[PDB]
């Protein structure tokens, strides 16, 4: 009756912080025996819940949101934290209870040819509401028209590459991050153990 956390974390296909990936866990026994107890976890921290109580806590549903960001930007995934990734890309609430985990994927997702497949968000018109998927293909602007008919000025594309390549230092090594949010709204709990 074990949850699919295994796959979730080991699928090694993580897409992007741009239009992140989600999963709604339900109908399982949340073991946790491996969670925050596996060996290669680098950083784990939850707000609102203690780890052992967590191992004994029980809930109605779970939301996991995995993505990949640059190591120097992990400090921006935090309650109400302000920056770029946390203001225009993906913003977690202020009273968010749950924990995040981050791995230095300095080998798994990188290529000498440039593992820049993912394009993070660097141009947004207005700050994000918490958990607002804003995957879009538009041209952010300054002049009248967008780049379809203009060039140079007002020809911006919000999806900018990362350029992950091995010479990059630690501060620029792709960290894979996963955030857990436990919802408790009036419903029978299908996740406890």
């Amino acid at each position: 009756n074990l949850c699919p956390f295994d796959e979730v974390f080991n699928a090694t296909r993580f897409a992007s912080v741009y239009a992140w990936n989600r999963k709604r866990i339900s109908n399982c026994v949340a073991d946790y025996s491996v969670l925050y107890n596996f060996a290669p976890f680098f950083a784990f921290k939850c707000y609102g819940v203690s780890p052992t109580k967590l191992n004994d806590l029980c809930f109605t549903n779970v939301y996991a949101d995995s993505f990949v960001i640059r190591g120097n930007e992990v400090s921006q995934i935090a309650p109400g934290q302000t920056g770029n990734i946390a203001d225009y890309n993906y913003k977690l609430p202020d009273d968010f209870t749950g924990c995040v985990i981050a791995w230095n994927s300095n080998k798994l997702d990188s290529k000498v040819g440039g593992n820049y497949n993912y394009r993070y968000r660097l141009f947004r018109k207005s700050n994000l509401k918490p958990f607002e998927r804003d995957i879009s293909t538009e041209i952010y602007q300054a002049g009248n028209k967008p780049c379809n008919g203009v060039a140079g000025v007002n020809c911006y594309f919000p999806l900018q590459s990362y350029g992950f390549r091995p010479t990059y230092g630690v501060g620029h090594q792709p960290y894979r991050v996963v955030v857990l949010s436990f919802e408790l709204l009036h419903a029978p709990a299908t996740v406890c153990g």
Partner: antibody, heavy 118, light 109 residues
Framework: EVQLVESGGGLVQPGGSLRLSCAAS????????MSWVRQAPGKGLEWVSV???????FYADSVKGRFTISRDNSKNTLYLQMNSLRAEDTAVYYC????????????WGQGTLVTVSS | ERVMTQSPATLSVSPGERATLSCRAS??????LAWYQQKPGQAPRLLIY???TRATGIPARFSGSGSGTEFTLTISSLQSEDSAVYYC???????????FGQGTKLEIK
């Protein structure tokens, strides 16, 4: 033409306050990453402050806690309020629109001298 | 906070020849750079961003090179008005960040 014009430069006694203003043309500011730079006479340059297109601002450490950036979106202009000017801050301040990886800082302002009484 | 150091301080080359300016970083900077030419009397002017991409309009006479922690700017044929100060600006942390250099003084004869 696209330009940034500045005002507020002058002289004020130390510890006093001042307010720098920046007007733009042919380009929007509300949706443009703004960055105020300054230059001491004869020395290099240093990033002073930045305001984003959503409002979340940031400041350098040397001036943290003393300067506050704001912008009158209604008439397409930027502003920087200063306080507690000490002996270092005598410098010329520039207004810039910085894009970053997609084109580094380009459009700059004529500048404004800021010296103190003594 | 990567500290950039320019070199040499001064350079005097006969008109019509090449000119070489080095700017040295302390960390890794990959291809995050730019070059500014601040003709004496007004604000600087952007010449070449990223690694070597020539800003719009900027005469082809300029050429940038280098990567990692070391970069170089090269001018094909200096005309009389090329005399100015030049600065290498890094931006490895863009929101919010930049770090300037000490500048270089270039003259003619």
């Amino acid at each position: 033409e696209v330009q940034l014009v500045e005002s507020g430069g002058g002289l004020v006694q130390p510890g006093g306050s001042l307010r720098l203003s920046c007007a733009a043309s042919g380009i929007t500011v509300s949706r443009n990453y703004m960055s105020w730079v300054r230059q001491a006479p004869g020395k290099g340059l240093e990033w002073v402050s930045v305001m984003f297109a959503g409002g979340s601002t940031f400041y350098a450490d040397s001036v943290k806690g003393r300067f506050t950036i704001s912008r009158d979106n209604s008439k397409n202009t930027l502003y920087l309020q200063m306080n507690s000017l000490r002996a270092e801050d005598t410098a010329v301040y520039y207004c810039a629109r910085d894009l970053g990886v997609v084109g580094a800082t380009d459009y700059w302002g004529q500048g404004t001298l800021v010296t103190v009484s003594s | 906070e990567r500290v950039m150091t320019q070199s040499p301080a001064t350079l005097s080359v006969s008109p019509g020849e090449r000119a070489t300016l080095s700017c040295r970083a302390s960390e890794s900077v990959s291809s995050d750079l730019a070059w500014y030419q601040q003709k004496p009397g007004q604000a600087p002017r952007l010449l070449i961003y990223g690694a070597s991409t020539r800003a719009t309009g900027i005469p082809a006479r300029f050429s940038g090179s280098g990567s990692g922690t070391e970069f170089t700017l090269t001018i094909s044929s200096l005309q009389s008005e090329d005399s100015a100060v030049y600065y290498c600006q890094q931006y490895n942390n863009w929101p919010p960040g930049y770090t300037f250099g000490q500048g270089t003084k270039l003259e003619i004869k």
